[PDB]
Amino acid sequence: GSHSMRYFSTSVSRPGRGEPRFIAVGYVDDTQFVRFDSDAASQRMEPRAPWIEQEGPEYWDEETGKVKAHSQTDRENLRIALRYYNQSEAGSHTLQMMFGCDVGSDGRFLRGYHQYAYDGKDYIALKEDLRSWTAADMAAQITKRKWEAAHVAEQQRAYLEGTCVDGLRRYLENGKETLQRTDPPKTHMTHHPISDHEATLRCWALGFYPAEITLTWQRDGEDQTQDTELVETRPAGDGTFQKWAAVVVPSGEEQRYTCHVQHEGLPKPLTLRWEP
Amino acid sequence: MIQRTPKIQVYSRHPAENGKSNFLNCYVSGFHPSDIEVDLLKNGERIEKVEHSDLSFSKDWSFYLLYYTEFTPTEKDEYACRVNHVTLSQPKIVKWDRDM
Amino acid sequence: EDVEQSLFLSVREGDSSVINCTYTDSSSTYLYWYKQEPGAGLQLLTYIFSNMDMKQDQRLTVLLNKKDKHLSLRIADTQTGDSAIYFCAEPSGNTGKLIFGQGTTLQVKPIQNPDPAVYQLRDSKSSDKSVCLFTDFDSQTNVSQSKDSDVYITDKCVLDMRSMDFKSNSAVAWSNKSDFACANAFNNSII
Amino acid sequence: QLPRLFPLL
Amino acid sequence: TGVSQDPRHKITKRGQNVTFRCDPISEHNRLYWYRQTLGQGPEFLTYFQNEAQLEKSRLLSDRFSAERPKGSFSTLEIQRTEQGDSAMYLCASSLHHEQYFGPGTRLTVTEDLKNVFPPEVAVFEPSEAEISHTQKATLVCLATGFYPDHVELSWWVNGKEVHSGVCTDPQPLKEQPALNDSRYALSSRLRVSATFWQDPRNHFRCQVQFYGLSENDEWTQDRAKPVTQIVSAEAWGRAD
Structure with a gap:
């Protein structure tokens, strides 16, 4: 039945040793298809599955642009978290983000996800209804009221029901042998x-x-x-x-x-x- | 500031038999924060050409990482994974055991 | 590759005006209508997200066809006060920066029964200077330009007198020269 | 396929 | 009406430097600069995510330089202005995706400050013919020979601004529509009842607000310095 696509992204601030390290990886179900590492030489969204290498030139230029923008925004979000928790900029902190979509057997949109954790604790989560947010703490309440005022959920829902599911359907047809398989134990x-x-x-x-x-x-x-x-x-x-x-x-x-x-x-x- | 010590598993890709090309795996999961040192050892000595997976995490936000190398097992040769993390006072060695 | 909309749309007061707009990228999750009055700045008029077919607010209707990248704005019961420039805007790249159409000037035409006349108006300050007013003419009148570079003719202007429900088209001519009569001032075809 | 905009906390 | 821009209008000699200021809505993290020429859509200049300038267009040449030092306010500096720089300079802010624009900074770049002139304003009284036929009276106001075209025309009746019975041309018309530094003219109509016009106690004032030179601008010509000013003209009712 269900297939899922997930992006997992980690920002780690290393005050002294330069700008924060940003790593992002993409999965379809339990198969990785891409990675970005801010510290690496390439400075590019890289293929991490043989079946994704047949995506055209524009795919790779676009995904690279979008993952570098994601880099900047989560870099800014570490600094905002410092303010909200009144922490010193001497400390090292971790921002984790996970988002993506599920489709059923019938290829229809099932589920969306958009979640953050700050040094390993739930911060804010898009609810299953994709209309509102779950804040896990008092800092996250500030974010939640901002996001409800700016209609962030309505905007993310359009991505999740739009480009996310469109991506997932395409990968499922182009990586068919690998992704649409069961190997019994x-x-x-x-x-x-x-x-x-x-x-x-x-x-x-x-x-x-x-x-x-x-x-x-x-x-x-x-x-x-x-x-x-x-x-x-x-x-x-x-x-x-x-x-x-x-x-x-x-x-x-x-x-x-x-x-x-x-x-x-x-x-x-x-x-x-x-x-x- | 949440800290979780790594769960360390040392195993082969395939059922081990001596003389047969294979892959030695060290999977480290459930750990926070992300900084971790992992080494594969043959008879206590560091194996040089070792690959690792891209940093990812599970639903509960704990990190995981796979370290691996091609190896041909033998009767004698003893294999081990050494991990250090902020949550360990001393580097932890887990020996490879075919029975597991 | 640009956001394309038409430069100009003429509609009759009380009718529905549709403004069409084709945008660049299917991956764009929202599309805006801004409105600009002669003096004032860009007003955010309405928006729609890429996963909605249609959105309503008072007289405004937005229709989206994501497949064809077609966005449209429908104004019900168009009033003379709806005259302005309408810009469709789409996010470009990864910053949420906007690209804009060139913008549709919406000209709303009064339905008033025409009563066309040319009047001479005399300067208030004890002078011998005059203007010509061409007023209360049909909304389909092309008031054409002066052959003469020392005769100035304004565009058609819609005046609303609200206490009476009375709209009129007006244009103004003037010249510094002596032999300027109001009789000869305004060349106009009813198109 | 990544989104073209990420929210600020 | 939350985004502030300073100054609203600016005149500078070609080759001089000018600085604009934009104050975004209180807590807005994202700030955008756009240029707009009359007739046309705004064009992106640059983008700030808090203090960080993450994107500039090729429109933003060496001469153009934006800063947003503390997040908060942003400034755009043009060095050695050319006449191609004349435009509305817009600012927008958002929390996320919704962009709110300010009223803009209307820049005029002129070869010489002596090219600047306030309006002359005259009021033209209604015709007896119009009153006889339509029982209505039209006053016309005529503002002539002003440069640049930064004016706001309003009507005042017994000392109070009128918001009905008024048509002002949407765009001034040039006295030489082909020339680049032509002076401008602007007309406006006030239409009232014949009875209101026919009461000589009634006072009609056409007002033109001109935006000209700042009081620190250099000026060595003999005619009054064409600063920001109100020029008016008036008529009284006519019992005819």
Whole structure:
């Protein structure tokens, strides 16, 4: 069903060591297609996927112009945040921004996003209705009243329902092989004795796309969210993802435990039990 | 000023077997702020030609970064990822373990 | 590549005036109508976002066709006070800086039953100097220019007397020379 | 495809 | 009506320098300068995001220089002015996308300050013929031989400005419409009831506000210095 496009941008002020560093990356679902690094030699929006390289010359000149303008504005926004929080300009701070759009199976606009965080905390977020803002703190209330007075939401909504979705539809047709695919997880169990009395069962999911996945543990059909360990979903480095979950288990009790895997690429959710 | 220590995972792209070309991965996620030092070690020595991904972050705003190099595993050779961050007093080494 | 609108639109008082405008980039998320009166500055009249078909405010209607890059302004029940220059404006590049059409001068014509006359008016200060007033003529009258460089003729001017509901077209001629009669002053065709 | 205008806090 | 510009009108000798000021709406972060020639759309000169000047056009040559030192106010400086520089210089501000424009700085660049003249103003009384046929009376006001064309014509009836029964030509007409430094003329009509005109207690004053030289401008000609002034002419009712 749903496809998404996201831009993630980080501004980091380094007072002394020059102007703030700005990094932006674009994703369609869990595939990167571009990057900009203010500190790099090129000074350009760069391709980061083989399928995006067939975008014409004007694409690259326009996206470069627009990401350098984004650079300037988020540079100014760090200085405004200093005022609002009455912080010294000796300190290093992080402004993070995430925006983009979703389309359904039918190719219709589903969802828009436009969110900021200031040194790792929610600052302001465009609501799901795309008509109003969520301010997480007292500084963000100032921004919110400014933005409601200037009709910033109405203007962003036109971008999100316009150029954002138009971009996403085009990428989905030009990167079809990579983006409109599911790779099901290859699953298995490992068993690691850790004592006379204790053992670790590890449930594995390798080589799946997209990255969205659920690994859950049960003990005789009861949810085991206890002595349980879930690693972050990690890239394989080749367009696919990996994950494991583990439970530490009294010796002899292995057969009572089940790993349950959900992924779009599986017809039915798997159950796995230790029995090699 | 929110600080989150990195979660460090050291693994291969493919199931490891000795003599077979492969990729050694060090994924660092859940960390704030963005400044981080990552090294891949072969028998405690820094591997020289190491690539890394472009700085990005998850919904919760925590950063992630992948460091990787081509390698051919062997019986003997021991591989490791060394990370330093503002939230660590001492560089953290995580050894590569085929069982993981 | 420019914002194109027509330089001039003539409409009859009480009719609907449509002003058309083709803009440059589909990626433009808003489009403005500014209005300029003879003396005053640019008034922000109305706007529309690229994801709306149509917007209404009093007598003003905006229609947008994003596909063709066609924007239009509809004035319902046009009054003589709606006479002004209308500029469509679109954001250009990444700064929100505006590019502007050349602007449509809207001439609203009174519907008053014409009663054309030329009068001579004498200087108030004990002098022998005069003007000619050509007044209350049809709104379709082309008041043409003087052959003579020492005879000055103004443009057609619409005067509104509100207490009566009375609009009239007026033009003024004058000359320094002796042999200037009001009889010969105004060459005009009713087009 | 990036937007052509970003808001100031 | 929140954006301020100073000065409203300016006259300078060609080859001299001039500075304009723009005060944006209180808290507006984005500020734009545009040039406008009569007949035509404004053309972008430059763009400020707070203090930072992020974009200039090729219109902005070496001679043109804008600053916005503290955000807040902005100034545009022209050095060694040419006659091609004569134009309205507009300022706009916004919080985000909506641009509010000021009333502009109307610059006139002239070879010589002796080319500047205040208006002469005459009032022309209604015809008996008009009053007989239409039961209406038209007064015409005629302002002649002024340069530059920075005038505001108003009618005053028993000491009070009238906002109805008035038509002023939208543009002055040149006494030599082909020449570049021609002097200007401007006409206005006041139309009233025959009865109002026929009461000789009624007083009609045509007023022309001229924008000329500042009182610090150099002046060595013998005719009065053509400073900013009001020239008027008047008639009384005529019982005829």
